[PDB]
Design a protein around this ligand. Structure first.
Ligand SMILES: *[C@@H]1O[C@H](CO)[C@@H](O)[C@H](O)[C@H]1NC(C)=O
Ligand SMILES: *[C@@H]1O[C@H](CO)[C@@H](O)[C@H](O)[C@H]1NC(C)=O
Lengths: 240, 100, 240, 100
C-alpha cells in the first residue's frame, strides 16, 4: 500500500526490449496506464478492468503490450524500444472507472543509441559567504550535481547523519549542460538554509547526497574506465 | 495548499471549414512543486482525450496554477459528453460538463 | 532615457544579414554587448569605451561587428546570420568599467530557413466557471495564443478600454506545441482574476490582447494566403 | 523584493590532471518573474567570463533564487583575480573576491 511501480528508473539502449510492472492497491477493480512526455499531461494508454483490457486507444505503436493475468498485478512490455519511448509511464488504480485515482511513483524511462553516454553525477558542496551570514544572519549551502546522464537522480541533504527536508530547496528538474546538442549531460543544484549560528558550529556536519540511477548488473560494459551503474555521489563540509 | 480544478464554458472556433469545440480546465491553489499537478480529461465512451497543458505558473499573489486545453470537432459532441477534468496529486477531479 | 534598443523583435531568414542598434544613456562612458541563449546568463560579446573597442573576447564568429562612431550610438551587424545567432542580444551602459550597468529592452532574434514558418497568434478567451465563482467568490478569465512563430508576442489585458496589470498572471515564456520537432509553433496563456461581482456585470468589457511581431514591410511574401506581418490579435467577452 | 547576490567560498576539484578553480554566485530575494535575474561575472583583465546558470528556483519559503557557477584553471588565478558577480535588474553587483 498503496500503488507501487518497478522499476522507478530504467535506462536502456535502442533496440533493447524492456518491461515494467505495477502493483495497485488491494481491492481496486480498475487499472490505468499513462504516459507523460515533454511536460505534457498524462496521455492515456490502456485500461484494465479486472484483469481485462476494455480500452486500447492511447497506444500509438504496437510494440507496447500490457498484461494483468493475476488481476492484481500488471506488466507493460515494450519490444524494440525507441527514442519516442523516452518518457514517464504512470500507473493508476481505483474501485472502478467512476472513482478517484491513486497514482504510484511511476517509471522514468530513457532510451539511448549507446550506453556509453551514461555518467555519474559530479557532486560538490559550497560554503555560505560571509556577506550573506552577516546580513541575513542565515547561512545557505549549495550542492551541484553535473555531468550525469540520464537525468535519473534523487538529491537530498543529510545533517549530522540524518536527512533533512526543512529549508531544502532543489531545482524542479535537471537542466541540459548543452541544450543545443540532442545528446547532452544534465546538471542540478540545491540549497539548504540554516541559521548563521548553526553553520558556525564545527560539530555540525553537512552533506549533500545525490542518488544516481544508471546501468544495472545485467548490462554488459566494455569501456575499461569504470562503469556508470546505479550509485550515489555525495559532498560534505564542516561548519565554521 | 488544496488543488481545485474547474471546467470553463466551452468556446467555438474555426479550423478548416469545420466548427471546433474547445474547452479548458483550470486548477487552482496548487503548491509550488518541482513536479506539478498533471491535467487529463475523460470522455463519454469511457475513453480519455489527449490535451495540451501550459504548465504551472506563479501567480502575482504568490500562488501556482496549471492549465490545459482540449480540442475536438463539434461533430463528436454526441459521444464524449459529458466532459470531465482531473488533476493532482491522490488525484482530484470535477463534475461532468454536458457538452451537447 | 534610459537605454533603448531597436528593433526589439526581429525575425529573419538564414543567409540574410541583419543590423541592431542601441542608444545608451547620455553621459555614459562605457558600453557593453551581451548574448542570452538557452536561458543561460548574459554571455559577454564586445566592449565599447568612448567609441573605442577595448575587448572582443566574447565574439565567436567574425560575422558579427559593432561600431560606435558617434560615441553615443552603437550598431551591431551580423552578416549571413545563422541559427546559432537566434538569441537575445542585450546592451548596457555605465559611467565606466567600474560602475553599475543599465540595460535596455534588448533585441530578441530568431533566424529560420524559410520565412513561410511565420504565423500570427490564435487568440481566444474563456469565461469563468460557475464552480469557481460560487466557491471563491472570484472570477478568472483565460486567454490562449496558439500557432504563432516565432515566440515574439506581448500579451496584455484590457478592461473597459484600459489596460490592466493587477491580477494579471501570464506564462513566463511561450511553449512549443511540439517540442520534438526542431521547427515548431508556440503557445501562450494568461489569467485575469477579478471579483465575482465584477465579472457578473454585463457593462464591464474584458479583452485579451496579444502583440505579435512578424515580418516587416521590407520583406517579400509569396504565399497567396495573407502575410504574417507585425500585427495584434485579441479576443473579448462581456460580463454576466 | 530586493535582489542580493553573494560570492561563495571557492572550491578545488580535478578534471584531467589539472586543478580546477570553481566558484558560484547566489542571488537572493529575487521576485517571481516571467523573466529572471541574469548572472554574469567579471575578471581582472577587464574581460568577462562565461558561466553556467541554473535559473531561478521557487524556495520552500515562498521566494526565488537564481544560481550560476564558474569554472577555470587554477593556473590563471593570477590574471582574473579578484572576481566579481553581477545580477539584476538596473542591475546589481557584489564586492570583488581575491582568488589568488
Ligand atoms: C464510442 O466509442 C467508439 C469507439 O471509439 C466510437 O466509434 C463511437 O463513436 C463512440 N460513441 C458511441 C456510439 O458510443
Ligand atoms: C590579461 O588578458 C590577456 C589577454 O587575454 C591575457 O593574455 C593575460 O594572460 C591576462 N593577464 C594579464 C597579463 O594581464
Amino acid at each position: 500500500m498503496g500503488v507501487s511501480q518497478s522499476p522507478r528508473y530504467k535506462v536502456a539502449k535502442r533496440g533493447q526490449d524492456v518491461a515494467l510492472r505495477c502493483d495497485p492497491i488491494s481491492g481496486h477493480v480498475s487499472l490505468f496506464w499513462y504516459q507523460q512526455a515533454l511536460g505534457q499531461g498524462p496521455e492515456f494508454l490502456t485500461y484494465f478492468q479486472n484483469e481485462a483490457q476494455l480500452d486500447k486507444s492511447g497506444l500509438p505503436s504496437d510494440r507496447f503490450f500490457a498484461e494483468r493475468p493475476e488481476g492484481s498485478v500488471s506488466t507493460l512490455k515494450i519490444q524494440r524500444t525507441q527514442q519516442e519511448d523516452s518518457a514517464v509511464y504512470l500507473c493508476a488504480s481505483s474501485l472502478g472507472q467512476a472513482y478517484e485515482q491513486y497514482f504510484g511513483p511511476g517509471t522514468r524511462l530513457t532510451v539511448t543509441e549507446d550506453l556509453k553516454n551514461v555518467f555519474p553525477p559530479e557532486v560538490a558542496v559550497f560554503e555560505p559567504s560571509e556577506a550573506e551570514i552577516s546580513h541575513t544572519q542565515k547561512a545557505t549551502l549549495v550542492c551541484l550535481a553535473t555531468g550525469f546522464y540520464p537525468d535519473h537522480v534523487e538529491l537530498s541533504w543529510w545533517v549530522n547523519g540524518k536527512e533533512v527536508h526543512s529549508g531544502v530547496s532543489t531545482d524542479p528538474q535537471p537542466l541540459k549542460e548543452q541544450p543545443a546538442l540532442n545528446d547532452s549531460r544534465y546538471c542540478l543544484s540545491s540549497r539548504l538554509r540554516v541559521s548563521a549560528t548553526f553553520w558556525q558550529n564545527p560539530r555540525n556536519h553537512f552533506r549533500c547526497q545525490v542518488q544516481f540511477y544508471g546501468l544495472s548488473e545485467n548490462d554488459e560494459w566494455t569501456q575499461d574506465r569504470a562503469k556508470p551503474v546505479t550509485q550515489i555521489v555525495s559532498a560534505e563540509a564542516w561548519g565554521r | 495548499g488544496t488543488p481545485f480544478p474547474s471546467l470553463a464554458p466551452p468556446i467555438m472556433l474555426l479550423v478548416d471549414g469545420k466548427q471546433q469545440m474547445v474547452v479548458v480546465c483550470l486548477v487552482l491553489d496548487v503548491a509550488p512543486p518541482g513536479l506539478d499537478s498533471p491535467i487529463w480529461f475523460s470522455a463519454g465512451n469511457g475513453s480519455a482525450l489527449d490535451a495540451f497543458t501550459y504548465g504551472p505558473s506563479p501567480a502575482t499573489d504568490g500562488t501556482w496554477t496549471n492549465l490545459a486545453h482540449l480540442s475536438l470537432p463539434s461533430e463528436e459532441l454526441a459521444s464524449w459528453e459529458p466532459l470531465v477534468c482531473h488533476t493532482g496529486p491522490h488525484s482530484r477531479s470535477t463534475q461532468p460538463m454536458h457538452l451537447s
